[PDB]
């Protein structure tokens, strides 16, 4: 079995000197990746060391009290692990690691990575857009069904469409509102709204469709993912040009028995069709084609099974351990 350090993106609760946790109390895509990843890792019986997230006891899991990047680099210089798995985007790197420690990253950004050697990408669209070479492995966002509402949880479906993410132009909140209005359905707008003008223009334009609820967390987040009719993942090629790297909410919605309407943006082209349908860019959604797009979305059972088949936390973590071992074997790229 491996000892594997998971370097989470080091990040402070806004306003606080407290840390954002893995998993996160609210908004936080990468911290969710690490959490369904570490769960998988541990189920495979690997030893996990959680860094950049000083956070929640389970066997095999060590939460290192290191969050400051220099606290991490220091801890990592003397750490007795086999695999440094960076999820932070290069807050730390390969140099200064003890000899025979393998370096690996999962790339979660639209920009080219600090550390392209031993880098992995959420999608082929991402790899391409970041300049990743052909032998660079593409490994999707993983999802632990245990973190999310199951069929056994008995959460009933309701009428609304759901947006969960930052209320920002590249996330397509306005386009979500335009789709939901085209279907004659409410959009619950769950997410941090930090850009006032764009928020106000959403409500000015689709005020009667959208219900803004702010950033959400814990039980509410899971109940919302579980109950929504569809989750809207409508990222837009705006200024990068925005290419969605891995689209965290697509595995969450699907694993919560919720199908997805998204765009073909970056990674959405590759994953959305497995659990829903891809629509075009913009806000010009003809109503009946839209309601028609809604009514050919799979059922809770089929998306919940596609999620696990394709992105299951154990399956995906096994795809990573095979890389860790290529690395430790003397394998490299790119």
Ligand X SMILES: O=c1ccn([C@@H]2O[C@H](COP(=O)(O)OP(=O)(O)O)[C@@H](O)[C@H]2O)c(=O)[nH]1
Q: Which residues here bind a second copy, judged by CB under 8 A?
A: 9-12, 14-16, 69, 88-91, 108-109, 111-114, 131, 169, 194-198, 200-201, 237, 239-241
Q: Residue 259: which of 247, 280, 273 has the closest Cα?
A: 273
Nearest to 42 by CA among 64, 23, 63, 58: 58
Q: Does 109 bind ligand X (CB under 6 A)?
A: no
Q: Which residues are annotated as a binding site for UDP?
A: 27-28, 171, 216, 221, 248-249, 252
Find the part of the chain contacting ligand X (CB under 6 A) among 42-50, 61-69, 142-150, 214-222. 214-222
Q: Which of 248, 258, 274, 323 binds ligand X (CB under 6 A)?
A: 248
Sign of CA dihedral 318, 322, 327, 328: positive
The partner in contact with residue 200, picked from a second copy, ligand X, none with C-beta cut-offs of 5 to 8 angstroms by kind, is: a second copy
| Angstrom distance (rounded) from CA 42 to CA 48 | 7
Residue in 28, 54, 264, 312 binding ligand X, rule: CB under 6 A: 28
Q: Which of 54, 142, 145, 165 binds ligand X (CB under 6 A)?
A: 165
Asked if residue 190 binds ligand X (CB under 6 A), the reply is: yes
Based on CB atoms, which residue is closest to ligand X, 29 or 54?
Answer: 29
Q: What is the 3-state secondary structure (H, E, C) of 214-248?
A: ECCCHHHHHHHHHHCCEEEECCCCCCCCCCCCCCH
**Length of the chain (residues):** 334
175 near ligand X, judged by CB under 6 A: no
The arrangement of strands across the sheet holding 47-51 comes to 61-63, 47-51, 3-7, 83-86, 102-107, 119-121
Torsion of the alpha carbons at 65, 79, 316 and 119, rounded to the nearest 10: 110
Q: Are strands 47-51 and 61-63 parallel, antiparallel or unpaired?
A: parallel
Nearer to ligand X, 166 or 291 (CB): 166
In the list a second copy, ligand X, none, the entry touching 254 (Cβ below 5 to 8 angstroms by class) is none
> Which tokens go with 258?
């919720």
Position with the least CB separation from ligand X: 29
By beta-carbon proximity to ligand X, the closer residue of 268 and 308 is 268
In sequence order, the 6+-apart residues with CB closer than 8 A to the CB of 154 are: none
To ligand X, the closest distance from the beta carbon of 215 in angstroms equals 4
Residues that bind ligand X (CB under 6 A): 26-29, 32, 164-166, 171, 190-191, 215-217, 221, 247-249, 252
């Amino acid at each position: 079995p491996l000892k594997v350090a998971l370097v989470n993106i080091p990040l402070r609760v806004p306003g606080s000197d407290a840390w954002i946790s893995v998993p996160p109390q609210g908004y936080g895509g990468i911290q969710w990746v690490v959490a369904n990843l570490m769960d998988g890792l541990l189920e495979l019986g690997h030893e996990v060391f959680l860094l950049g997230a000083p956070s929640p006891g389970r066997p095999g899991l060590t939460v290192v009290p290191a969050g400051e990047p220099e606290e991490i680099e220091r801890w990592l210089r003397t750490a007795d692990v086999d695999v440094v798995h960076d999820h932070s985007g290069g807050v730390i790197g390969p140099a200064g690691l003890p000899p025979g420690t393998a370096f690996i990253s999962s790339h979660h950004f639209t920009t080219r990575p600090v550390n392209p050697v031993g880098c992995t990408y959420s999608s082929r669209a991402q790899r391409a857009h970041c300049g990743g070479g052909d032998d660079a492995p593409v490994i999707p966002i993983p999802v632990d069904p245990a973190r999310y509402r199951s069929a056994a949880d008995q959460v009933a479906k309701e009428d609304f469409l759901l947006f969960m993410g930052r209320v920002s132009p590249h996330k397509g909140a306005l386009e979500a509102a335009a789709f939901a209005h085209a279907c004659g359905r409410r959009l619950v707008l769950a997410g941090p709204a930090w850009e006032p003008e764009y928020f106000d223009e959403i409500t000015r334009r689709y005020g009667s469709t959208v219900e803004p609820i702010g950033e959400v967390g814990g039980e509410r987040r899971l109940d919302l993912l579980a109950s929504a009719h569809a989750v809207l993942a409508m990222s837009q090629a705006v200024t990068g040009i925005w290419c969605e790297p891995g689209a965290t909410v697509v595995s969450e919605a699907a694993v919560s028995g919720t199908p997805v309407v998204g765009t073909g943006n970056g990674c959405l082209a590759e994953i959305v069709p497995s659990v829903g349908e891809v629509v075009g860019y913009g806000t010009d959604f003809a109503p009946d084609e839209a309601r028609r797009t809604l009514a050919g979305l799979p059922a809770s059972d089929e998306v919940r099974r596609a999620a696990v088949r394709l992105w299951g936390h154990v399956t995906i973590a096994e795809r990573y351990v095979e890389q860790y071992r290529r690395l430790l074997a003397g394998a490299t790229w790119k």
